[model samples]
Target: EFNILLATDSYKVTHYKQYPPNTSKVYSYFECREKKKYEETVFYGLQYILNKYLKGKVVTKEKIQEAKDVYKEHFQDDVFNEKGWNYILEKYDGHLPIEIKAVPEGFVIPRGNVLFTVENTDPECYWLTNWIETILVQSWYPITVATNSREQKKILAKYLLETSGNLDGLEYKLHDFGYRGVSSQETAGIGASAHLVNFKGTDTVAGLALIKKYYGTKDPVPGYSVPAAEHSTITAWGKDHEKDAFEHIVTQFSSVPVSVVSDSYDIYNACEKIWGEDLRHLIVSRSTQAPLIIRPDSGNPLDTVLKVLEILGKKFPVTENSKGYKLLPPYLRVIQGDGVDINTLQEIVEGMKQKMWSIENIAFGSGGGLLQKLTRDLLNCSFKCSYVVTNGLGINVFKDPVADPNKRSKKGRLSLHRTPAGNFVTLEEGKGDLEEYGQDLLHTVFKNGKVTKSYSFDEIRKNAQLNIELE
Candidate 1:
């Protein structure tokens, strides 16, 4: 009944169009990320990553058709079925259902334990199992970065609120600016999805379309000037280049949200000498306008950030009474976009180890490293082949002696829960009856693939706000 090749058989009876491939569209997206790496490592995982991150992330077919109905529509040869999708599906004749155990998308998962897993229900579909890994890892990166960046931004924000004289006034001005630096549009989009879980805003507007597709909704905090933008990108320190950097950002994005590269010159003095307090006042006076983000693209990032803050604090004060100006400084954030890996971000916070600067005033834009940095190697984030089956019923369990003991995955299914304090998980050797879980760490989410619980996007966003004790 299931044929691996349907070129001249059953598939022909059903689907008879010519499905060449959507190779160009997908490849073009892949190239954007590949150029950043200058190597082919990202290419290895590009196809699956694109499928996972882009398959239906945004712009519905219905919406596209609506536009086409009004204007002349052009058709591409790559359109599925208009070509031969049947031939493609026939090559992968079977699929199996697999149960996965994952830490809910936003949680800070530690080094060991299954973030998610797949176990095939139909033996014939097992071959499709590995396809999930690429997407799974891609999906997890932004959550990790968001989870990590959230803590960093939170700590920074709190310090600013208390000392910077802006108390609970500008909470909605935080922005995530790590898009262009990312390896691929898919990874960047996922990163944008994850950032929303933590920060009040992001600069990756393209992510807006993505979140709508995946979560079945839009940014709940609309009209709040969130998920902002700073796409006027550049990487030089010459005169013509500097003017190109400033003018492009100022002109192309004539919107409420604005940010530009300042480090092409001495970032320390660029704001004061070039833009000055005049730009700051223009932004501060506008309705629904977020503060201008001055991106420092090169230097010892942490020190540069501190220096930028020092300069701004003394000059463009955003407090209750700086010269009788009853206001908070326009939400000016010192955004950094170079060499910002997970470790570097952590280092920035640990330096808050002992300082009086407002941590919230500092923001980071991370991309390439997280894409190329293997979480499996850096954080010991990996999966193990914990079990297999043989003889149509016999179990074949797999374990790795060389791996960290904590990361050695268990051999069976589990029940999860959440209690007054911690998340709980109860492991069972085989499928049978459900057992009561005494551990406080497990969370009960879905049962039998049917959502037993539901939450509004705002409620989920609020959950992210709670300072849960993370592993």
Candidate 2:
């Protein structure tokens, strides 16, 4: 349904006539572009884009005609380049005459480094490269989401050190299973793909399905979920069987942890009267010790969380973890999803530590906090034209504006390398080919309508799992 000819912006449609005389080639790179602001972004989702959208036979004669007609009516002029479109269709059989070189999908590199580069392999179709920048640069979405999730992971994992448990337990701590606060289903899917880079626990099936389709293998872990209760199931009990509903949910999925939103009428009463007092035996006597994860869905998060832990600790027989923080009985715990974001999560986790509650005693399900953070503000990623060849000469194309020096672009032909000290550096102006640098990290993944290299979900997670040596 997507017409590649119509995929780009309206201004891009007129760029065929905008380049310099005899523009033999155009080279463009994608980067976060803001240095040290993000520090590192988990490069991902480009391969998925390639496999699903931009690969073989993307430009058809019919699609080209459609785009030409659209632009003619749009501009009220004959400005569409029929020659280039027909040339691509007849010569390459609609396969794009372009090459894309990029860092492997999961590499964690500093901002401003070239994540990927795209240029026309054929001199005739020099405009093809930047025209597709519209879709190619959308890698920002997943990269932003993955980078965010990875950062949140460190915060949760750091305070987790205060409690005594396996480090993998940190995976479920920032549990993102029901994050539907995004703009579209596709956006949610891509966002989840990035989040899943560091954690396997997710209820957003779109990510798992996207992962399976684009990045899965034998056991790439098609994301996992638990029997979690939403407002409907709990509120449908009409506040009367709030306790009974709690009992039914906990007992129904007693062997495995069940998350029940316990804030229908009175969260305090639900925690104290129902879970702590009335159904205390069900927790202790459940089939397995997986814990009935009590979800406090409203109120000031840190205050309510510690308060719930306070009541649960008293009623359910609290014991000290090896780290001296209080732990609930094996079959009881808390989950606060309702207003939890990374900031709130860090705040609440710190509060729990101050209150001597085990960080492991709680799991957070952040909705908008995780999915709805103002991203372009938090993470400003961009794909710009850094270098190009006009006729027989190459120029290090960049924009240095008096308005914002921070917006100044990079110089020509970027390449990434690892220094002997094991840090990443982006070599600009074709300096990567020099012998002084370490191996150039960028490799060809897409060339002439074919994908050269690919990575599985597990492979990406492994690479994204950089050293977080938090002492």
Candidate 3:
């Protein structure tokens, strides 16, 4: 109920003028820790708060009193007595009292740099500046997920380039299998949408809906998934009759790409005998028509993929690419969906390259590793007050904990901009030679509790792609 306190008595209301001249504004910004090298933060999730929290409320007198009562119930016994309450209630006219400015939704900033700036638009609304931190701190999750997915794409692209000579068919390289692996339906949607910002393949249906809702994407959906089978469908057909299960999937989706899980009983046997011997003609004949993706779900990913590649290499006709790597026939491919993370994915790719095998012969699918295996500390995201005005004078407020220098914060009003040398520069507002800077990176994304900018999915994707290219 800290937010309830924010809507009521946040100590800002009682001490609005308690600071010493020109105490007209307070400015704050969010930044990442210094240790996360090579990973820049992606800005996201602000639209949700702008549309759902600030603008979503109807500030009637009844609700205003309700917020006051909530504050009194919690902090009534405190020394402040919830003083100066009338100032906020009267000034807001029963509406949220704040304004926000941020970078574009998909902009990427370096670690330990400013992501967004918060301050009071109205000189008297100083209390509302830091109060919004209760919600603004939540942007960490979407930003981290977006950054992780983008880094994964970079890794996959490198291996593809090394082994295949170019980034062909990169769209379907890493598929999202994380919807069921996340904590809630909401997490699934937010995490999956972030992934699609960098790649185009996914099985997370909720992510597609999220992009369509928040990013205004439809007609051509943001993500794509192919016809695939689960363990129940294959095991239910009886281990002895596994051939019937394979045949059913192939015949049903003969003209379209299909994926079949093969580790239900004997993964190698299913590949060598059932697919290679019993149904070789069916698979070979349809290879030209559609790709048949074989998924092995329960083994050491690198070893199992290497073994499967060897088997498929002997059974199917192989060709050499310009890089002198052995590529599988166009109709067949393998997906390692189990125990796959960033490190393992790299190891698998390195193994294939060491064996002189083509990286295009395999793709990857990640579940929990892509969505659920992270926390806010993974990127060390935090929001802090940097400047405050008191007694009509501007003061650069900051904290420098002697225990940890990394916990030290920035000072004064902050503005982010690009430099002439193609790097981001953070400067104290109105300081130094202002004419020496490039375009200001931060823009007005929200104003007076209303969303001022809405981003399209294509634009968001393009911004992310440009960042990768620049890197």
Clashes of each: 21, 1, 12
How far is each candidate from the true structure, as Cα RMSD in Å? 12.1, 1.7, 3.3
**Of models 1 and 3, which has the larger TM-score?**
3
Best TM-score among the predictions, by candidate number = 2
For model 3, the run of ten residues with the poorest summed lDDT: 1-10
What TM-score do all the candidates reach, one by one? Answer: 0.59, 0.96, 0.90
Ranking of models by lDDT: 2, 3, 1
Tell me model 2's lDDT, rounded to 2 decimals. 0.82
Candidates 1 and 2 compared by lDDT, better number: 2
Tens digits of per-residue lDDT for model 1 on 228-326?
A: 233335544345565556655555554555666677647776767555654544444534354567777778867776666667666675564332322
Per-residue lDDT, model 1, residue 168, is 50
lDDT of candidate 3 over 1-471, digit per residue (tens): 124334432554445446444667878888876661446777777776666566633354455456567656755744332333345556655355566777888787788778888888777667667666767777787888888888778888888888887887776788999988999998899899888888889999998877887786645799988899999999899878999999999899999999999999989998999899998888887755488999999988999999998998888888999999999888898999998777788899999999999889999999999888978888888888888877767788888899889888888877777877777778774452365676667777777656777888878777777333555
| Lowest summed lDDT window (length 10), candidate 1 | 25-34
Error of 3 at 13 (Å): 11
lDDT of 1: 0.44
